[PDB]
């Protein structure tokens, strides 16, 4: 299949009302991204895209994240991956990934 955009604004709205950089960290946690990943704020770089590509498999090593000029392509094995389905899976996994207590309380 083809990579699709994961709109950062929709992540903020799904988990209450996160500040930009907490939503970015939540995405990095969901995709187990290395801590040496740079992702700008949308206001600072409105052209920057966070993409998600559904891949056939992961390797036995670290998650194979791909990097373009002005967009980062996160990799998932989710069947039928789309913006909505990633957002729903993030909400399922969020309790283990990052504590959003000041904004989002799943309890």
């Amino acid at each position: 299949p083809k990579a699709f955009q994961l709109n950062l604004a929709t992540v903020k709205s799904q988990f209450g009302d996160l500040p930009t950089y907490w939503a970015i960290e939540l995405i990095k946690r969901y995709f187990s991204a290395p801590p040496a990943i740079y992702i700008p704020d949308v206001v600072d770089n409105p052209d920057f895209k966070i993409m998600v590509q559904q891949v056939k498999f992961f390797g036995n090593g670290l998650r194979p994240i791909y990097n373009s000029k002005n967009m980062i392509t996160f990799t998932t094995m989710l069947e039928g991956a789309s913006e909505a389905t990633i957002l729903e899976d993030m909400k399922k996994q969020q309790p283990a990934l990052l504590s959003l207590l000041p904004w989002y309380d799943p309890n």
């Binding site: 996160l18 500040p19 907490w22 960290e25 704020d41």
Partner: protein
């Protein structure tokens, strides 16, 4: 010496640059590297306030109750060494807050959430005092007074 037949002038210098990652489709390393000598003419080259503890206003309003009502003092924008913006307002008088917890450091978590190992420098001052004068606010710069330490 006629054996040497020439010279090489070696100029060892120190260069200052930013913590910049390599670009994928970059024609060059887009890292503003200059010789430190330029910092004498342009003080911003070595100007580093990255460690400042700036109480930051949550865009969501989650901690808005700790800050001066925008009706009196509208929040303003600060750009840090990364050219990114935070919304900053003065703290409300008679406030009890986690000073680190509400700092820009916990909204700008590119480096990480604050933990027990993060401490405040005992060396500090009262920077500004905001007084309501006859219905409008006057900003008093008090960072040079002996009582502000």
């Amino acid at each position: 010496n006629p054996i040497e037949g020439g010279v090489v002038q070696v100029l060892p210098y120190i260069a200052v640059m930013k913590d910049v990652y390599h670009e994928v489709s970059g024609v060059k390393m887009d890292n503003e590297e200059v010789n430190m000598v330029e910092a004498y003419r342009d003080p911003s080259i070595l100007d580093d306030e990255s460690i400042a503890l700036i109480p930051a206003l949550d865009p969501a309003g989650s901690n808005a109750d700790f800050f001066v009502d925008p009706a009196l003092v509208p929040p303003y924008t600060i750009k840090n060494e990364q050219n990114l913006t935070i919304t900053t307002a003065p703290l409300k008088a008679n406030v009890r807050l986690d000073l680190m917890g509400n700092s820009n450091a916990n909204l700008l978590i590119q480096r990480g959430m604050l933990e027990v190992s993060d401490t405040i420098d005992p060396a500090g001052r009262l920077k500004n005092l905001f007084v309501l004068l006859g219905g409008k606010v006057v900003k008093f710069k008090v960072d040079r007074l002996p009582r502000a330490v």
